[PDB]
Scaffold this active site. Structure first.
Site, short mmCIF file in Angstrom:
data_model
loop_
_atom_site.label_atom_id
_atom_site.label_comp_id
_atom_site.label_asym_id
_atom_site.label_seq_id
_atom_site.Cartn_x
_atom_site.Cartn_y
_atom_site.Cartn_z
CB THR A 107 -6.47 -2.98 2.80
OG1 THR A 107 -5.25 -2.28 3.09
CG2 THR A 107 -6.68 -3.53 4.00
CB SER A 139 -10.12 4.13 -2.90
OG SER A 139 -10.89 3.14 -3.22
NE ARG A 140 -3.29 -0.33 -4.02
CZ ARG A 140 -3.70 -1.29 -3.26
NH1 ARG A 140 -4.16 -2.05 -4.13
NH2 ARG A 140 -3.25 -1.64 -2.14
CB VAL A 141 -11.43 -0.11 -6.21
CG1 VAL A 141 -12.18 0.66 -5.13
CG2 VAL A 141 -12.77 -0.49 -7.18
NE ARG A 167 -3.46 -5.20 -2.23
CZ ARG A 167 -2.15 -4.66 -2.58
NH1 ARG A 167 -1.53 -5.04 -3.56
NH2 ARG A 167 -1.72 -3.82 -1.78
#
Ligand SMILES: Nc1ncnc2c1ncn2[C@@H]1O[C@H](COP(=O)(O)OP(=O)(O)NP(=O)(O)O)[C@@H](O)[C@H]1O
Ligand SMILES: [Mg+2]
Lengths: 486, 458, 458
Positions: free
Chosen positions: A324, A350-352, C181
Site C-alpha cells: 500500500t 498518505s504518500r500520495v 508498485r
C-alpha cells in the site's frame, strides 16, 4: 475426453483423475452443484480445491469440467445485495443482474496505462481527511490491534460515499456472521446500502472460500474502473485471508517460510492490491470500445490488517505496508483513552499526500499536521502548574484542544463544509481563546448549526475547494459572527 | 461390511468396496473384544481406502477385521431427557446408568452457520449478576471468556449463571467438560446436586483421560444438545470446561493425520476449527445459544494462536481476581479488566453506557489515590477526590452479591437484580445520593433499597 | 515441437523427445486461451522432459498443447534505441510507442566480467543527503544499498538519490523497477517526461502485480541493458527497486522446481542466485557503473537471509530503521548500523573521517546511557555524560532533512546540503559551539545556519 472422477478428497483438497482438456485455474463443476479450482495439473491426476462444503464428496463421483476459469457475475446490478464469496449466491432476494462476467484472477493494468491520482475520497472523519488524505485509485492501510475501530472506520468511509458518485464494496473475510449481519443492517439504516455491494465469507465457510473472496469482490469493483467510473472497495481483514491461504498451502504440503506462511504470501496480497488503481483516458476508451470516449475510472482500496499486541513488524503486516502507498495506524491505547478516531499521527502517512486533497483542504490541513505530532513530543508536561508558558504553555494548550477537535463519533461524517471547524476555528487562533476543553468539542457542533442557516453559499465551496483569494476573508466573517450565538 | 488394513495409534485405516465408500465425517463401528469401537472417518484416502480416528483405545485391534459403515455422522441423544445426566462424546450414559431414555438423536457434525436464520436484535442477556450486567454485560447469542482458575468461586459463578437463565429465564444450560481433570469433574457433579441446579444442565465429559478423538469432538456433541434446545425455542447457556483444551486436542489429531505444523506448531486448520465451533453458537430468529467458556492463555501470551484466535470470537470477558476475593466482595469479578463490547457501544443504551463508564472512573480514580494515601495524608486529598474515594469505596461494596447456589454454603438467601435496578442503584450512588448510608450498607444485597433498609437494621 | 506434461503454478514442464531437448537456459512459446506465452527452460529433467517457468499468467494452459522451441535465450534490445521508453522483462515495448529499437540484441543471461577486466576509482560523488554524504560516501563505480522494512521511506529515499545524482550525471541512466508498485513507475515516467530527462534514461518494469516469472528475470533484463551501455560508453547509472523482490520471486518457485528448502524456507541456491546478478554490476575497464538499489528487509529482521547475504555485495550500505522513523527523523538512516567500505581516511580526507567517527562514537555512547536514563532518570548522569546525551540528541536530529520529492505529502519544502556543510555543522556541534540552541533548532533543516535561524522563531 472432458470428464473425470474424484480419486481422493480430504480437508477441502480434491484429486481428480482424467480431465484431459482441463486447464490451470479452470473452475471444475461437481455435483450439488459446487465447483473446484484446478491448482495442480500433475501427470495423471489433477489437484483442485473445493469451493464450498466437501463433507459429502466421495470417490467415483462424476466431474465435468466447464469452459472458462474462475469468473463471477460482475456488473452494476450487484449493489444493495450481499453476495457469497464465489458469486451470485444471494441474500436474501432470488435474482441478480449480470452485465456479464469477469475473472476473479487478473493482471493489474499496465505501467504506461495509469494516471497520477488527483482526486479525493472523503472519509468523513476529519482526523484522516486532513493529515492522511485518501485519493481516487489509492491503497490506504487500516492497521491496528483487535477492537480499535478498524472496521468502524471502514464502513463510515463507505457511508460517506452515499452520494459522491463512488460505488462501494465491503468484503467480509472470516468475519462472524452476526457481525456481518449487523454491519449491513446498519449499512441500510444510516443509508445507503444501495450504493455498496457486500461480498461475504463467514468465519465458518471454506478456507478457499475465504482466500478467494477478496479477488471476487475486487473483480466486481474492477467493472467500474474499466468503465470510466470511480469505485471504492475495502477488504476486511486481509489477515484472515492470509491465514486461510496458509491453511490450503500447508494442506497442499507447500513448504512454509516465515511464521509458517508460504513464500508467495506477498504475491497473494500484491496482485490483489495492485488491482486497485487509476486508469487513464486511453485505457478506459480502449476497454469501453469508444463508448466512454474520454473519462478516467478508478478503484480506490483500503484494506484492514489486524496486528497482535501492536507488533507492526510482523510478517503479514509488513508486506501489506510494503504494498500500500500509505497507512493508518489505529493505536490501541489512544483508543482506550477516548480518542476514538485513534489515528496515530507521526506514524500514519498518505504518500500520495497533497494531490489527494481538495484545494481548501491542503491549504489549511498543512497547519494541522505540525501541531499534532509535535504536541505529543512534549507530552511530558501533562498540562500542569505551568513553565515557560508563553511558548510551552500556548503550544500545548492549543494542541490539546485540537486533538479534541479531531475526536469524532462514528456515523457522523463531516463534509468539506463542516471543515470550516477544522480549517479556521482551530489552526490559526479562534477556538483556542474562548472555549475550554469540554466546551471545546461542543461549540463546534453549534457552529455547524449557525452556518446551516447563515451559509447556504458555503454549499458551493464544498462543490469546489476553491479557497479563492477572497474566500479566505469571506469565511473569516462567519466565524466572528458565531461569537454572538451558541 | 469392510476390512481394516492399517492401525497406527488411534489412527485405523479401513478400506471398502469402491462403489460405496464412506462419507468424510460419517461414523463406523468395529467389534474388538467386548465393546464396539466407533470410528470417525477423516479422509477419503486414495485407493478406495478410508482413514479414521478411534473414539476409544485402538489397542487390541487385529489388522484384518470387519467394520460396518452406517449413515450416522456419529449422532447423540438430544432433548429435555439429557439434563441431570452425564454423557460422553458418543452420547452414552457415563453416569451410573439411568439409561438416558431419549426422544431423538442429532448428528454432532451439523453446520449451524446460518444466514437470515440469524436475528437482527442484538438483545442483551440479563444475567442477574450486578457486576456482570453493568460492568461486563452478556449478549444474547454471544460468547464470553471466563478467566480465573481456582480459589475464586468460578464453579459457583457457573452454577448461579446456570440457575438464573433457568428460573428468571425459560431455557436451560449445557456444560461441556473438555480436557480437564476427572477429579474435578466429580466434585463439580456433587456441587451441582447440592446446589440443586443439576436438574437443569445437560453435561458432557471428555476428560484428559480419553483419547484425542473424544476430546476434539466432545465439544460438538454438547454443542448440538444446546442447538436442540435452541430450535426448541429457548435461550440456552453453553459452558465449555476449557476451550483451550479443545483447540489443543485438534492439534493432536491434526498431528496423527500427519498434517503439517503451522505457526508455533499449531494445526493449519485451527483458523477453521475455531470458526465452526463458535459460529454455531449464536442467536437465531427461533432461539439462541449463549456460551461462557473457560480460557487458558499459554505462558500468559495472549498473542499465542490458541488465545489470539479464540479472542477474535469472544464478545465479553469475565475476570475473577484473587485480590478482589480477599477483601470479601464475592462475585469476584474485577470491574476493570473485565471487558464487554456489548456495553462500549450505543446498544445497551446511553444511560447504561454512561453509568458503566462512570463507575469505570470513580472506581479507577480510587486506585491512583490509594497509594497517594498510604504514603501521604488522606486529609490533604481535595474535597471532590476524598468524596470520590468515599463513593468508590461504596460502589465496590455494592457490586458484591449473594448467590442462591451459595445458600447451602452460607445461609443468606441472596437474590437477582434486573439491569434497571442495577443502573438505578449504581447511578444513584455515584451522582450525589446515599452518601448518608454507611459503607457496610452495601455489602451483599440486592437492589439499592435492599441496602437502604440494611442501613436501618444497623 | 513438443507438448505439455504438467502444470503447477508458474512451473510447467514440457516433453520434447530427444532430438531437440532445449538447452538449459532457453525460451519457447505456447498458445493459450488467446495469446503468446513464453516459457523459460530451467532444468533438463531426465527422460526428455524439461522444467520451465511461465513468463506470464500460467492460468488457462491445457495439459497437452504443443509448444515451439526456439534457440534464443531471451530477446531484449540494447543500445541508444532503448533510451526512449519503458520495456518488458521480455524486451517488449510496454508503453504506447511501437519501438524503433534495437540495432543489436543481447541475452538476459550473461557472465560476470573477467577479474583483471575489473576497474575501480575513488572519485566520490556527492548526494544531497547529509546523512549519506557524511556517514557513507561512494565513488562512481560503486554499489550502494538501501536496507529497510516496510514504510521506512524506502522508495522516496531512492527517488531523492536519483534526482540528486541524475543531474550531475550528464550521462546514461537505466532504472529497472522490479516487484514495486506500478503507481510509482507511472509517476516516475510522467514526472521525468515533463522534466524532459527521459532521453538519457531507460525504463524497464516488472511489477509486483505481474506473475513470478517476470520478476526473477526482469532484474536481469534490466542490467543487461546497462551492460551494453557500459561496454561502449563509460559512465552509466543503474537504479534497481527491491533486489529482494527478485530473490523473493525465486522462492515462490523453488518449491515447484522440486528442490529441498534451505533455512527459513528459502532456496538452497540463495547464495548463488544473488551473487550471479549482483556480480554482474561492476566497473569494467571499458566503462563503469554507478548503482543504488533498494534491498528490502522482511519483518525488520536484518538477520533474515536475503539481507544477511546481500550485505557482502555492497560498497556502501545505508540502513533505515523503524525506530528512527517512529521518532520523526525521516532520512531514517541508522547512523550506527549504516556504513561504507570507503569511509577511509586516505580516501575521504582526515577531516571527514574524524568527523564521521566522532559523530558515530558520541551517538553510540548515548545508546549505552539510554538504559540507565530510562530506569533512573537524567539526574543520575555525571555533568559530563549529561552533556554527552544533549550533544548527541542534537546530532541525532541534525541528521534529518526534508527531501524535495517528499514535499508532496508533507508541508516541509525540500533542501540540499553540501558535503562541505555537512562536515562544518556536525564537526561544529561536536566541538560544543552550537550548544545554547535548543534541540528543535536542529530538527529538519539544511545547513547549520538554518538551525540558527530556526532557533530564533523557536
Ligand atoms: N469513531 C468512534 N467513535 C466512537 N466509538 C467508536 C468509534 N470507532 C470505533 N468505536 C467503537 O469501537 C468498538 C469496536 O470497533 P471496531 O470497528 O469493531 O474495531 P475493529 O478493530 O474492526 N475490532 P475487531 O472487529 O475485533 O477487529 C465499537 O464498540 C465502537 O463503538
Ligand atoms: Mg471488526
Amino acid at each position: 475426453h472432458n470428464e473425470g472422477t474424484i480419486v481422493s478428497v480430504s480437508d477441502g483438497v480434491i484429486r481428480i483423475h482424467g480431465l484431459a482438456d482441463c486447464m490451470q485455474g479452470e473452475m471444475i463443476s461437481l455435483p450439488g452443484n459446487r465447483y473446484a479450482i484446478a491448482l495442480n495439473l500433475e501427470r495423471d491426476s489433477v489437484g483442485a480445491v473445493v469451493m464450498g462444503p466437501y463433507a459429502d464428496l466421495a470417490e467415483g463421483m462424476k466431474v465435468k469440467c466447464t469452459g472458462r476459469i474462475l469468473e463471477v457475475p460482475v456488473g452494476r446490478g450487484l449493489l444493495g445485495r450481499v453476495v457469497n464469496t464465489l458469486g451470485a449466491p444471494i441474500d436474501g432476494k432470488g435474482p441478480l443482474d449480470h452485465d456479464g462476467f469477469s475473472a476473479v484472477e487478473a493482471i493489474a493494468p499496465g505501467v504506461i496505462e495509469r494516471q497520477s491520482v488527483d482526486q479525493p475520497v472523503q472519509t468523513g472523519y476529519k482526523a484522516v481527511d486532513s493529515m492522511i488524505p485518501i485519493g481516487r485509485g489509492q491503497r490506504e492501510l487500516i492497521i491496528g490491534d483487535r477492537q480499535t475501530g478498524k472496521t468502524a472506520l471502514a464502513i463510515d468511509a463507505i457511508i460517506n460515499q452515499r452520494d459522491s458518485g463512488i460505488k462501494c464494496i465491503y468484503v467480509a473475510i472470516g468475519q462472524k456472521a452476526s457481525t456481518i449481519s449487523n454491519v449491513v443492517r446498519k449499512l441500510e439504516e444510516h443509508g445507503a446500502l444501495a450504493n455498496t455491494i457486500v461480498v461475504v465469507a463467514t468465519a465458518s465457510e471454506s478456507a478457499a472460500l475465504q482466500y478467494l473472496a477478496p479477488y471476487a469482490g475486487c473483480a466486481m469493483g474492477e467493472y467500474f474502473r474499466d468503465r470510466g467510473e470511480d469505485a471504492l472497495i475495502i477488504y476486511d481483514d486481509l489477515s484472515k485471508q492470509a491465514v486461510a491461504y496458509r491453511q490450503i498451502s500447508l494442506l497442499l504440503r507447500r513448504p512454509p517460510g516465515r511464521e509458517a506462511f508460504p513464500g508467495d504470501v506477498f504475491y497473494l496480497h500484491s496482485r490483489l492490491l495492485e488491482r486497485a488503481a487509476r486508469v487513464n483516458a486511453e485505457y478506459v476508451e480502449a476497454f469501453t470500445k469508444g463508448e466512454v470516449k474520454g473519462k478516467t475510472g478508478s478503484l480506490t482500496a483500503l484494506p484492514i490488517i489486524e496486528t497482535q499486541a501492536g507488533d507492526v513488524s510482523a510478517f503479514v503486516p509488513t508486506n501489506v505496508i510494503s504494498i500500500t502507498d500509505g497507512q493508518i495506524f489505529l493505536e490501541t491505547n489512544l483508543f482506550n483513552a477516548g480518542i476514538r478516531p485513534a489515528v496515530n499521527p507521526g506514524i500514519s502517512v498518505s504518500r500520495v499526500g497533497g494531490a489527494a486533497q481538495t484545494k481548501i483542504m491542503k491549504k489549511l490541513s498543512g497547519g494541522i499536521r505540525t501541531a499534532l505530532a509535535q504536541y505529543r513530543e512534549l507530552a511530558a508536561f501533562s498540562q500542569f502548574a505551568s513553565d515557560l508558558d508563553d511558548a510551552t504553555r500556548k503550544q500545548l494548550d492549543h494542541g490539546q484542544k485540537v486533538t479534541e477537535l479531531l475526536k469524532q463519533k462514528q456515523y457522523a461524517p463531516m463534509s468539506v463544509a463542516q471543515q470550516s471547524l477544522v480549517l479556521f476555528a482551530a489552526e490559526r487562533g479562534y477556538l483556542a481563546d474562548v472555549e475550554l476543553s469540554k466546551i471545546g468539542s461542543f461549540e463546534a457542533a453549534l457552529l455547524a448549526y449557525v452556518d446551516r442557516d447563515h451559509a447556504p453559499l458555503m454549499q458551493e465551496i464544498n462543490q469546489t475547494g476553491g479557497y479563492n483569494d477572497e474566500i479566505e476573508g469571506k469565511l473569516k466573517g462567519i466565524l466572528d459572527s458565531f461569537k454572538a450565538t451558541q | 461390511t469392510g476390512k481394516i488394513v492399517q492401525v497406527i495409534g488411534a489412527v485405523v485405516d479401513v478400506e471398502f468396496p469402491q462403489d460405496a465408500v464412506p462419507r468424510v465425517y460419517d461414523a463406523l463401528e468395529v467389534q474388538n473384544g467386548n465393546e464396539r469401537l466407533v470410528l470417525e472417518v477423516q479422509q477419503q484416502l486414495g485407493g478406495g481406502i478410508v482413514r479414521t480416528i478411534a473414539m476409544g483405545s485402538s489397542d487390541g485391534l487385529r489388522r484384518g477385521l470387519d467394520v460396518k459403515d452406517l449413515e450416522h455422522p456419529i449422532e447423540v441423544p438430544v432433548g429435555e431427557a439429557t439434563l441431570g445426566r452425564i454423557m460422553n462424546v458418543l452420547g452414552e450414559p457415563v453416569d451410573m446408568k439411568g439409561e438416558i431414555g431419549e426422544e431423538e438423536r442429532w448428528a454432532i457434525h451439523r453446520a449451524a452457520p446460518s444466514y437470515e436464520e440469524l436475528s437482527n436484535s442484538q438483545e442483551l442477556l440479563e444475567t442477574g449478576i450486578k457486576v456482570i450486567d453493568l460492568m461486563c454485560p452478556f449478549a444474547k447469542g454471544g460468547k464470553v471468556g471466563l478467566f480465573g482458575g481456582a480459589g475464586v468461586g468460578k464453579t459457583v459463578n457457573m452454577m448461579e449463571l446456570i440457575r438464573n437463565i433457568a428460573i428468571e429465564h425459560s431455557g436451560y444450560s449445557v456444560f461441556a467438560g473438555v480436557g480437564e481433570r476427572t477429579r474435578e469433574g466429580n466434585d463439580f457433579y456433587h456441587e451441582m446436586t447440592d446446589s440443586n441446579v443439576i436438574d437443569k444442565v445437560s453435561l458432557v465429559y471428555g476428560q484428559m483421560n480419553e483419547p484425542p478423538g473424544n476430546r476434539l469432538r466432545v465439544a460438538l456433541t454438547g454443542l448440538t444438545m444446546a442447538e436442540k434446545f435452541r430450535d426448541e425455542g429457548r435461550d440456552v447457556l453453553l459452558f465449555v470446561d476449557n476451550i483451550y483444551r479443545y483447540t489443543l486436542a485438534g492439534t493432536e489429531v491434526s498431528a496423527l493425520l500427519g498434517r503439517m505444523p503451522s505457526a508455533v506448531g499449531y494445526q493449519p486448520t485451527l483458523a477453521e476449527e475455531m470458526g465452526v465451533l463458535q459460529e454455531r453458537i449464536t442467536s437465531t430468529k427461533t432461539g439462541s445459544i449463549t456460551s461462557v467458556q473457560a480460557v487458558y492463555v499459554p505462558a500468559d501470551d495472549l498473542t499465542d494462536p490458541s488465545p489470539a484466535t479464540t479472542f477474535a470470537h469472544l464478545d465479553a470477558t469475565v475476570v475473577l481476581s484473587r485480590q478482589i476475593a480477599s477483601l470479601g466482595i464475592y462475585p469476584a469479578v474485577d470491574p476493570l479488566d473485565s471487558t464487554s463490547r456489548q456495553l462500549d457501544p450505543l446498544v445497551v443504551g446511553q444511560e447504561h453506557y454512561d453509568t458503566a463508564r462512570g463507575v469505570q472512573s470513580i472506581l479507577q480514580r480510587y486506585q491512583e489515590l490509594k497509594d497517594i494515601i498510604a504514603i501521604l495524608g488522606m486529609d490533604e486529598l481535595s474535597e471532590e477526590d476524598k468524596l470520590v474515594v468515599a463513593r468508590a469505596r461504596k460502589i465496590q461494596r455494592f457490586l458484591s452479591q449473594p448467590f442462591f447456589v451459595a445458600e447451602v454454603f452460607t445461609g443468606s438467601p441472596g437474590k437477582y437484580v434486573s439491569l434497571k435496578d442495577t443502573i438505578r442503584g449504581f447511578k444513584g450512588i455515584m451522582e450525589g445520593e446515599y452518601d448518608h448510608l454507611p459503607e457496610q450498607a452495601f455489602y451483599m444485597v440486592g437492589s439499592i433499597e435492599e441496602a437502604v433498609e440494611k442501613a436501618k437494621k444497623l
